[PDB]
Amino acid sequence: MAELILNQRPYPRDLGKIVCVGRNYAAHAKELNNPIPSSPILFIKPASSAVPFGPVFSIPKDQGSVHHELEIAILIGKALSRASTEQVAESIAGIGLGLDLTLRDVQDQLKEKGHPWERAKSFDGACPLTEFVAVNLASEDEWQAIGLTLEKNGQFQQQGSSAEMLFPILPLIAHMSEHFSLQPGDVILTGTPAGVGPLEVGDSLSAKLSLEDNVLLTCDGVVI
């Protein structure tokens, strides 16, 4: 599986699990004709689904539509269990980006039957993940200033700010830790903004992570 990268070198703890939120951005719930949540939808992707974020993304081939979903990724550095938001902020080792790659037709069918989502979310290559970068934020306020951008084939595809999250980063993770204890090496996917859509072989993607409109990292890849 591993490792994760933090500050351009290997993170000392192997990738554990990838805890994900559904529908953290209102416009993304609307674009798919889903009801905006009042509590978060929670699922988990396994270490076996992680791959480097580019230069190539391999997608499943004969299983219907495969969707890109860019999301702010959070690396957990210290164990969290039933944690406060202060404990969460002190635990975060860095921030990066992930693609929550989703077999969308498979998900539609799973959902309709009330079935678990793993077939659509946990497949090999389901979680391209960038390197993480340590940020020592000036106030808890600044967690609301994190941005993401996806471009596909040179053109705008997705953009979001953590300001827009229904469940902001710190309280989301604090709440997550109430349901599943979090260990060092765990990753959090904080939700995809509007603009999700299918991927085809040969699509090129360009992903950008920012802080108050300053670029933290950029990562590119082509679909194969």
In the complex, residue closest to Zn ion by CB: 100
Burial class (CB in 10 A: 0-12, 13-18, 19+), 137: middle
β-pairing, 9-10 vs 70-76, is unpaired
Give the residue carrying structure tokens 């859509």.
197
Alpha-carbon dihedral sign for residues 7, 8, 14, 16:
positive
Identity of the residue, 81 or 153, whose beta carbon is nearer to a copy of itself in the bound complex: 81
Identity of the residue, 100 or 203, whose beta carbon is nearer to Zn ion in the bound complex: 100
Contact 145, 212 (CB under 8 A): yes
Closest Cα partner for 77 from 10, 2, 13? 13
Q: Least separation, in Å, of the C-beta of 23 and Zn ion?
A: 9
Per CB under 5 A, which of residues 74..113 are in contact with Zn ion?
A: 100
Q: Least separation, in Å, of the C-beta of 12 and Zn ion?
A: 27
Cis peptide before 3 (omega within 30 of 0): yes
Question: Which span (10-18, 66-74, 76-84, 88-96) binds Zn ion, by CB under 5 A?
Answer: 66-74
181 binds, options a copy of itself, Zn ion, none, Cβ within 5 to 8 A by partner type: a copy of itself
Which residues of this protein are in contact with a copy of itself, per CB under 8 A? 1, 14, 16-17, 22, 41-44, 46-49, 81, 110-119, 121-124, 179-183
Contact 163, 45 (CB under 8 A): no
Identity of the residue, 68 or 208, whose beta carbon is nearer to Zn ion in the bound complex: 68
12: which residues sit within 8 A by CB, 6+ positions away?
none
Identity of the residue, 179 or 215, whose beta carbon is nearer to a copy of itself in the bound complex: 179
Closest Cα partner for 77 from 133, 137, 143? 133
42 binds, options a copy of itself, Zn ion, none, Cβ within 5 to 8 A by partner type: a copy of itself
List binding-site positions for Zn(2+). 69, 71, 100
Q: Least separation, in Å, of the C-beta of 115 and a copy of itself?
A: 6
69 binds, options a copy of itself, Zn ion, none, Cβ within 5 to 8 A by partner type: Zn ion
Identity of the residue, 112 or 213, whose beta carbon is nearer to a copy of itself in the bound complex: 112
List binding-site positions. 69, 71, 100
69 binds Zn ion (CB under 5 A): yes
Torsion angle, alpha carbons of 196, 197, 198, 200, to 10: -90
Residues in contact with Zn ion by CB under 5 A are 69, 100, 192
